[PDB]
Design an enzyme around this catalytic site. Structure first.
Site, PDB file in Angstrom:
ATOM      1  N   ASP A 167      42.934  25.382  17.865  1.00  0.00           N
ATOM      2  CA  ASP A 167      42.820  26.807  18.151  1.00  0.00           C
ATOM      3  C   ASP A 167      41.518  27.354  17.574  1.00  0.00           C
ATOM      4  O   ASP A 167      40.676  27.884  18.301  1.00  0.00           O
ATOM      5  CB  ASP A 167      44.010  27.566  17.557  1.00  0.00           C
ATOM      6  CG  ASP A 167      45.192  27.640  18.508  1.00  0.00           C
ATOM      7  OD1 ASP A 167      45.431  26.658  19.242  1.00  0.00           O
ATOM      8  OD2 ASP A 167      45.888  28.678  18.512  1.00  0.00           O
ATOM      9  N   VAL A 183      45.820  16.534  16.555  1.00  0.00           N
ATOM     10  CA  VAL A 183      47.052  16.466  15.778  1.00  0.00           C
ATOM     11  C   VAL A 183      47.366  17.810  15.123  1.00  0.00           C
ATOM     12  O   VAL A 183      48.473  18.032  14.629  1.00  0.00           O
ATOM     13  CB  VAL A 183      47.008  15.321  14.745  1.00  0.00           C
ATOM     14  CG1 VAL A 183      48.231  15.363  13.845  1.00  0.00           C
ATOM     15  CG2 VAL A 183      46.911  13.976  15.451  1.00  0.00           C
ATOM     16  N   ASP A 228      41.994  12.657  24.509  1.00  0.00           N
ATOM     17  CA  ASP A 228      40.531  12.542  24.511  1.00  0.00           C
ATOM     18  C   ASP A 228      40.034  11.098  24.432  1.00  0.00           C
ATOM     19  O   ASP A 228      39.500  10.672  23.406  1.00  0.00           O
ATOM     20  CB  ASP A 228      39.923  13.378  23.381  1.00  0.00           C
ATOM     21  CG  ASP A 228      38.445  13.648  23.587  1.00  0.00           C
ATOM     22  OD1 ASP A 228      37.916  13.282  24.658  1.00  0.00           O
ATOM     23  OD2 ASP A 228      37.812  14.228  22.679  1.00  0.00           O
ATOM     24  N   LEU A 239      31.934   2.531  20.827  1.00  0.00           N
ATOM     25  CA  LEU A 239      31.575   1.706  21.979  1.00  0.00           C
ATOM     26  C   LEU A 239      30.455   2.390  22.753  1.00  0.00           C
ATOM     27  O   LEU A 239      29.776   1.774  23.577  1.00  0.00           O
ATOM     28  CB  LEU A 239      32.788   1.471  22.876  1.00  0.00           C
ATOM     29  CG  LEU A 239      33.795   0.460  22.332  1.00  0.00           C
ATOM     30  CD1 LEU A 239      34.696  -0.048  23.439  1.00  0.00           C
ATOM     31  CD2 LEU A 239      33.076  -0.692  21.648  1.00  0.00           C
ATOM     32  N   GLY A 275      29.952  14.662  16.192  1.00  0.00           N
ATOM     33  CA  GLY A 275      31.181  14.821  16.955  1.00  0.00           C
ATOM     34  C   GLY A 275      31.397  16.305  17.189  1.00  0.00           C
ATOM     35  O   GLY A 275      31.384  17.093  16.242  1.00  0.00           O
ATOM     36  N   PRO A 316      34.374   6.306  25.556  1.00  0.00           N
ATOM     37  CA  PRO A 316      33.635   5.277  24.824  1.00  0.00           C
ATOM     38  C   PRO A 316      33.286   5.697  23.393  1.00  0.00           C
ATOM     39  O   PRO A 316      33.342   4.886  22.466  1.00  0.00           O
ATOM     40  CB  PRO A 316      32.361   5.108  25.654  1.00  0.00           C
ATOM     41  CG  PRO A 316      32.766   5.478  27.033  1.00  0.00           C
ATOM     42  CD  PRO A 316      33.807   6.555  26.892  1.00  0.00           C
ATOM     43  N   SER A 317      32.920   6.964  23.222  1.00  0.00           N
ATOM     44  CA  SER A 317      32.550   7.483  21.903  1.00  0.00           C
ATOM     45  C   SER A 317      33.752   7.582  20.954  1.00  0.00           C
ATOM     46  O   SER A 317      33.584   7.711  19.739  1.00  0.00           O
ATOM     47  CB  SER A 317      31.862   8.845  22.034  1.00  0.00           C
ATOM     48  OG  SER A 317      32.791   9.902  21.877  1.00  0.00           O
ATOM     49  N   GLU A 323      38.777   5.829   7.502  1.00  0.00           N
ATOM     50  CA  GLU A 323      38.242   4.490   7.322  1.00  0.00           C
ATOM     51  C   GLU A 323      36.919   4.335   8.075  1.00  0.00           C
ATOM     52  O   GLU A 323      36.829   4.646   9.264  1.00  0.00           O
ATOM     53  CB  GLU A 323      39.272   3.479   7.829  1.00  0.00           C
ATOM     54  CG  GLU A 323      38.769   2.079   8.039  1.00  0.00           C
ATOM     55  CD  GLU A 323      39.802   1.209   8.734  1.00  0.00           C
ATOM     56  OE1 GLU A 323      40.200   1.552   9.868  1.00  0.00           O
ATOM     57  OE2 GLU A 323      40.248   0.208   8.131  1.00  0.00           O
ATOM     58  N   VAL A 348      30.711  17.254  12.001  1.00  0.00           N
ATOM     59  CA  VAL A 348      29.789  16.138  11.824  1.00  0.00           C
ATOM     60  C   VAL A 348      30.429  15.020  11.011  1.00  0.00           C
ATOM     61  O   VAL A 348      31.241  15.272  10.123  1.00  0.00           O
ATOM     62  CB  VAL A 348      28.469  16.603  11.179  1.00  0.00           C
ATOM     63  CG1 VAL A 348      27.695  15.414  10.629  1.00  0.00           C
ATOM     64  CG2 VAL A 348      27.629  17.384  12.182  1.00  0.00           C
ATOM     65  N   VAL A 349      30.052  13.782  11.318  1.00  0.00           N
ATOM     66  CA  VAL A 349      30.593  12.625  10.616  1.00  0.00           C
ATOM     67  C   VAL A 349      29.547  11.951   9.741  1.00  0.00           C
ATOM     68  O   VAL A 349      28.475  11.581  10.211  1.00  0.00           O
ATOM     69  CB  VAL A 349      31.240  11.630  11.582  1.00  0.00           C
ATOM     70  CG1 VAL A 349      31.787  10.434  10.822  1.00  0.00           C
ATOM     71  CG2 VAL A 349      32.340  12.310  12.383  1.00  0.00           C
TER      72      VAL A 349
HETATM   73  C1  LIG Z   1      28.854  10.770  19.225  1.00  0.00           C
HETATM   74  O1  LIG Z   1      29.730  10.146  18.320  1.00  0.00           O
HETATM   75  C2  LIG Z   1      31.021  10.527  18.282  1.00  0.00           C
HETATM   76  O2  LIG Z   1      31.526  11.415  19.010  1.00  0.00           O
HETATM   77  C3  LIG Z   1      31.841   9.730  17.219  1.00  0.00           C
HETATM   78  O3  LIG Z   1      33.151   9.436  17.705  1.00  0.00           O
HETATM   79  C4  LIG Z   1      31.105   8.436  16.848  1.00  0.00           C
HETATM   80  C5  LIG Z   1      30.362   8.772  15.533  1.00  0.00           C
HETATM   81  O4  LIG Z   1      30.739  10.048  15.174  1.00  0.00           O
HETATM   82  C6  LIG Z   1      31.895  10.421  15.855  1.00  0.00           C
HETATM   83  C7  LIG Z   1      31.893  11.973  15.873  1.00  0.00           C
HETATM   84  N1  LIG Z   1      33.076   9.966  15.020  1.00  0.00           N
HETATM   85  C8  LIG Z   1      34.296  10.649  14.877  1.00  0.00           C
HETATM   86  C9  LIG Z   1      34.859  11.792  15.469  1.00  0.00           C
HETATM   87  C10 LIG Z   1      36.165  12.187  15.124  1.00  0.00           C
HETATM   88  C11 LIG Z   1      36.898  11.452  14.177  1.00  0.00           C
HETATM   89  C12 LIG Z   1      36.338  10.302  13.571  1.00  0.00           C
HETATM   90  C13 LIG Z   1      35.043   9.896  13.923  1.00  0.00           C
HETATM   91  C14 LIG Z   1      34.306   8.816  13.464  1.00  0.00           C
HETATM   92  C15 LIG Z   1      34.505   7.753  12.548  1.00  0.00           C
HETATM   93  C16 LIG Z   1      33.521   6.783  12.313  1.00  0.00           C
HETATM   94  C17 LIG Z   1      32.257   6.830  12.996  1.00  0.00           C
HETATM   95  C18 LIG Z   1      31.056   6.098  13.043  1.00  0.00           C
HETATM   96  C19 LIG Z   1      30.655   4.928  12.350  1.00  0.00           C
HETATM   97  C20 LIG Z   1      29.386   4.378  12.589  1.00  0.00           C
HETATM   98  C21 LIG Z   1      28.505   4.978  13.507  1.00  0.00           C
HETATM   99  C22 LIG Z   1      28.879   6.146  14.201  1.00  0.00           C
HETATM  100  C23 LIG Z   1      30.145   6.697  13.980  1.00  0.00           C
HETATM  101  N2  LIG Z   1      30.823   7.819  14.478  1.00  0.00           N
HETATM  102  C24 LIG Z   1      32.103   7.884  13.884  1.00  0.00           C
HETATM  103  C25 LIG Z   1      33.087   8.854  14.114  1.00  0.00           C
HETATM  104  C26 LIG Z   1      34.045   5.824  11.287  1.00  0.00           C
HETATM  105  O5  LIG Z   1      33.479   4.845  10.816  1.00  0.00           O
HETATM  106  N3  LIG Z   1      35.282   6.237  10.968  1.00  0.00           N
HETATM  107  C27 LIG Z   1      35.711   7.448  11.689  1.00  0.00           C
HETATM  108 MG   LIG Z   2      36.753  15.489  21.101  1.00  0.00          MG
END
Ligand SMILES: COC(=O)[C@@]1(O)C[C@H]2O[C@]1(C)n1c3ccccc3c3c4c(c5c6ccccc6n2c5c31)C(=O)NC4
Ligand SMILES: [Mg+2]
Ligand SMILES: [Ca+2]
Ligand code: NA
Length: 314
Positions: free
Chosen positions: A179, A173, A152, A113, A39, A155-156, A106, A43-44
């Site tokens: 910033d 938020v 924002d 999507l 993201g 689909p992502s 969570e 990173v997530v």
């Molecule tokens: C390219 O992917 C994205 O931009 C995502 O929105 C999509 C990807 O990471 C991002 C950064 N993401 C995020 C970017 C900003 C906030 C939360 C997320 C985020 C979350 C989850 C997942 C996730 C779960 C399983 C596979 C991929 C997942 N992602 C997230 C979450 C989740 O399970 N809980 C929060």
């Molecule tokens: Mg963004």
């Protein structure tokens, strides 16, 4: 339209129950299970809160800034602790540590999507009717109870899970975070309303537009900008540009639209009332909440979970 369901309300309390026992989030309490997605900004990861056994999604954003600045961000994110909507990813807690700010929430085993689309190739209308209701419902809560926009929608940013839940994520938020993030961290606006691409009026209308664009891409199978030729239309159903190009083509061109015949008129008219350039002319939340497409879809009994788990394997 923010009423609650039995199963829903019961699920909303469950999270609360868990969130209570978890307690203070500490860096050393987590264990990396795997990476979820990149993201923009950080990173997530799919972590494991050892002390509680819970599985979470930890967002990491490296921001080497003054303490008071960091302690400030964490102060702003404390707002997400009040967000209780079955259409928004549950928040666990935020904190800083060794250069990075952590946003624990969570976990959504269904992913975004964005990936779901790649897997399915193109999402079914009946299914997109569930997403619309979700996103539509999400934005309302974000405004109704939390008086803030999303800013924002894409689909992502639409996460789903094996339980058939559709929630939104990635809605600003923290002004300070934005910033400091605005530094090197920067994302696209190809999903943003033209009105904002001119520092003009921008409200939920901007989100409603974002949604409209996303819905089409998911329905069609690709980015509907600019409008794909007829060769593909007959290919996909039977039947590039620069970041600054699209940013303007979006402002100086007729909004995209769902191909006829393949989709239902109600659905077609729905998106159209969403992609209406003039935010004043474009449909508002409650307007869409009562749109034939939403009424027909809200009534339809669609096993989203089954279709999803089947579309991604799960
Ligand atoms: C390219 O992917 C994205 O931009 C995502 O929105 C999509 C990807 O990471 C991002 C950064 N993401 C995020 C970017 C900003 C906030 C939360 C997320 C985020 C979350 C989850 C997942 C996730 C779960 C399983 C596979 C991929 C997942 N992602 C997230 C979450 C989740 O399970 N809980 C929060
Ligand atoms: Mg963004
Ligand atoms: Ca440590
Ligand atoms: Na660490």
């Amino acid at each position: 339209e923010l009423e609650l369901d039995e199963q829903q309300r019961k699920r909303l309390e469950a999270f609360l129950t868990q969130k209570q026992k978890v307690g203070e989030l500490k860096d050393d309490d987590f264990e990396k299970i795997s990476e979820l997605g990149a993201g923009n900004g950080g990173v997530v990861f799919k972590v494991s809160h050892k002390p509680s056994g819970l599985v979470m999604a930890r967002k990491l954003i490296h921001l080497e800034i003054k303490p008071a600045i960091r302690n400030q961000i964490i102060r702003e994110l404390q707002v997400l602790h009040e967000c209780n909507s079955p259409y928004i990813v549950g928040f666990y807690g935020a904190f800083y540590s060794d250069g990075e700010i952590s946003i624990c929430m969570e976990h959504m085993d269904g992913g975004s999507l964005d990936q779901v689309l790649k897997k399915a190739g193109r999402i079914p209308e009946q299914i997109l009717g569930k997403v619309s209701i979700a996103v539509i419902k999400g934005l309302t809560y974000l405004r109704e109870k939390h008086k803030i926009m999303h800013r924002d929608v894409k689909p992502s940013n639409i996460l789903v899970n094996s339980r058939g839940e559709i929630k939104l994520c990635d809605f600003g938020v923290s002004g300070q975070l934005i910033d400091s993030m605005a530094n090197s961290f920067v994302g696209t606006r190809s999903y943003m309303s033209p009105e904002r691409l001119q520092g003009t009026h921008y409200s939920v209308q901007s989100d409603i537009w974002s949604m409209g664009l996303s819905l089409v891409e998911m329905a069609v199978g690709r980015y509907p900008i600019p409008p794909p030729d007829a060769k593909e239309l007959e290919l996909m159903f039977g039947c590039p540009m620069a970041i600054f190009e699209l940013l303007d083509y979006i402002v100086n061109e007729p909004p995209p639209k769902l191909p006829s015949g393949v989709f239902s008129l109600e659905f077609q008219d729905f998106v159209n009332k969403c992609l209406i350039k003039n935010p004043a002319e474009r449909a508002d939340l409650k307007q869409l909440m009562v749109h034939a497409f939403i009424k027909r879809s809200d009534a339809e009994e669609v096993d989203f979970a089954g279709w999803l788990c089947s579309t991604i394997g799960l």
